[PDB]
Amino acid sequence: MGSGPIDPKELLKGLDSFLTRDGEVKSVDGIAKIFSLMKEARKMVSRCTYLNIILQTRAPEVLVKFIDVGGYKLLNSWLTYSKTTNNIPLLQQILLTLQHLPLTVDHLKQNNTAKLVKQLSKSSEDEELRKLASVLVSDWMAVIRSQSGGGSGGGSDLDYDSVQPYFYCDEEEN
Numbered sequence: 227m228g229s230g231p232i233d234p235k236e237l238l239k240g241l242d243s244f245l246t247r248d249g250e251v252k253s254v255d256g257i258a259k260i261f262s263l264m265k266e267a268r269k270m271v272s273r274c275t276y277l278n279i280i281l282q283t284r285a286p287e288v289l290v291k292f293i294d295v296g297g298y299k300l301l302n303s304w305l306t307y308s309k310t311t312n313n314i315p316l317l318q319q320i321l322l323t324l325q326h327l328p329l330t331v332d333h334l335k336q337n338n339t340a341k342l343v344k345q346l347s348k349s350s351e352d353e354e355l356r357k358l359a360s361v362l363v364s365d366w367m368a369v370i371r372s373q374s375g376g377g378s379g380g381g382s383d384l385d386y387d388s389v390q391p392y393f394y395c396d397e398e399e400n
Contacts, residue, residue, distance in 0.1 A: 234269065234271040235271055235275060237269075237271075238263075238269070238271060238272050238275040238276065239275065241259070241260060241263065241276075242279070244256055244259060244260075245260075245279060248282065249278070249279050249282055250279070250282040250283055250284055250285075251279070251282070251283035251284070251285050251288050253288075254287070254288055254291060256288075257280075257283065257288045257291070257292055257295075258295065260276055260279065260280070261292065261295060261296070261297060263276070264276035264277070264280075265296070265300060267303075267304060267307065270313070270316070273304065273308070273316055273319075274315065274316060274319060277304075277319045277320060277323045278319065280292065280323050280326070280327075281319070281322060281323045281326050283326070286327075286328065289326065289327035289328065290327065290328065292327065293327060293329070293333070298333060298337070299337075301320065301323075301324045301337070301339070302337035302338075302339050304320050305317075305320050305321070305339055305342060305343075306342075308320060309342070314352050314354065314355050317346070317355050318354055318355040318358045318359070321343055321346075321355075321358060321359050321362050322358050322362070324339075324362075325358070325361065325362040325365065329366075330369075331366075331369065331370055331373060331392060334366060335392065340363075340366065340392065340393055341393065341395060343359050343362060343363060344359075344363050344390075344393045346359040347359040347360040347362070347363050348386055363389070363393070364389075367379075367389060367391050367392075367393070370391040370392045371391055374391060377391075
């Protein structure tokens with residue numbers, strides 16, 4: 227193959243000028259223009275580029291208002307949209323971006339994304355997606371255990387059933 231492809235990243239990286247030079251976040255104005263254009267989500271590169279910027283968005287107020295302005299529904303939307311094709315570098319970035327923002331038990335339960343990410347960190351055919359998903363669900367179950375009152379867990383010898391505090395799907399096959 228003497229012919230080469232085309233760079234699709236620069237098309238979405240034109241917006242990176244409206245963020246900081248490291249591609250983190252400029253302002254609450256910055257997240258909103260990104261929000262509307264990444265919402266379209268019709269390019270695979272638009273997915274990975276903007277989600278990486280929201281990941282590098284180290285301003286926690288910008289994250290909680292991202293959830294507020296519609297990003298909450300869009301996290302579940304893009305999760306399902308990526309799970310159809312099951313694109314490994316995409317799935318792991320979506321769950322890592324919502325791992326970056328402070329998400330509540332109300333949220334993960336309502337959108338059912340708690341179940342969707344937990345079945346990944348139970349047994350998927352890939353290391354990197356489920357180990358990032360494992361850090362995410364361990365963060366979530368730390369919060370959930372703290373909302374419950376307490377519990378040991380330990381960390382080691384800790385089984386897939388004993389890491390289900392509000393992840394218990396009581397679907398009785400019995």
